Design a protein around this ligand. Sequence first.
Ligand SMILES: *C\C=C(C)/C=C/C=C(C)/C=C/C1=C(C)CCCC1(C)C
Ligand SMILES: CCCCCCCC/C=C\CCCCCCCC(=O)O
Ligand SMILES: CCCCCCCC/C=C\CCCCCCCC(=O)O
Ligand SMILES: [Cl-]
Ligand SMILES: [Cl-]
Length: 264
Amino acid sequence: KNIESLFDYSAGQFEFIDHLLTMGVGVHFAALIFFLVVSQFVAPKYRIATALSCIVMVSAGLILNSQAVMWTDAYAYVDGSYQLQDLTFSNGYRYVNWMATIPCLLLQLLIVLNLKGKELFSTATWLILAAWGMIITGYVGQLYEVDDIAQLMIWGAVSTAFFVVMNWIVGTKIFKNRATMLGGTDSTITKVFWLMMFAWTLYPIAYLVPAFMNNADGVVLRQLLFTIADISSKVIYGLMITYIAIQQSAAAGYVPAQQALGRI
Ligand SMILES: *C\C=C(C)/C=C/C=C(C)/C=C/C1=C(C)CCCC1(C)C
Ligand SMILES: CCCCCCCC/C=C\CCCCCCCC(=O)O
Ligand SMILES: CCCCCCCC/C=C\CCCCCCCC(=O)O
Ligand SMILES: [Cl-]
Ligand SMILES: [Cl-]
């Protein structure tokens, strides 16, 4: 039912997909390490934001690692191309982890926006359920990518629905609590949000490849966009949130934070 299952890949598309996935594993487990290291440069009041990008890097990596092995498991060169075997490839696990990495990405944003008390857990919930409502409805849509573009669209429509509302929440929070930000970081955070806007919007694009390019080069397209989307929303976004967590820590009087940026 995945459109990946429909085609016999030329040797260069397979190998391209495989490297897409493997290099994805590489970069997540690599920022993973960096985040760990700079965790000591963040004050106790902001340390969970870097800690959450580590869960994302390992969540993202192990899923990408799962998919890479699964890629090569499912396919064998037969008779001039890579042909599906008795195992199948699927994007489904991308989704489930998005069920999981997205809450982490929001809490860390909400964290560096300086939300204490019932504000942050109340906003955290509405954003997860909206986000979760986006992912779940997108999943059921992508169950029909082969069999019913009709449903892929309407489920796609419901999902994007959720995307708009959830993005509306985030930005309202950014602009208000921007005030409370230390270190020139009020500026940076608004750039955090444009980054996510773009990054996140490549995923819908990647979900409509079946209706405008049901062919094997569409497979690779989709995997390319996912790879870019994942690097932007996960890795690069994490570094920016890392950047803001330390800058405030130093403004607040975390000596190990001033030390770190004072070295540069
Ligand atoms: C790992 C982090 C992120 C932010 C991946 C997020 C995925 C989206 C923002 C995708 C939204 C989609 C839409 C809006 C519609 C079709 C189903 C999707 C979930 C792909
Ligand atoms: C084994 C996978 C094949 C690809 C090799 C991967 C090489 C990794 C290169 C750098 C990691 C990308 C993230 C940049 C480093 C984050 C630290 C920083 O610049 O602040
Ligand atoms: C900032 C996110 C960047 C993520 C890195 C993705 C790297 C892709 C590299 C360039 C793609 C151009 C190579 C052309 C692919 C050949 C397609 C084919 O074999 O049919
Ligand atoms: Cl603190
Ligand atoms: Cl993930």
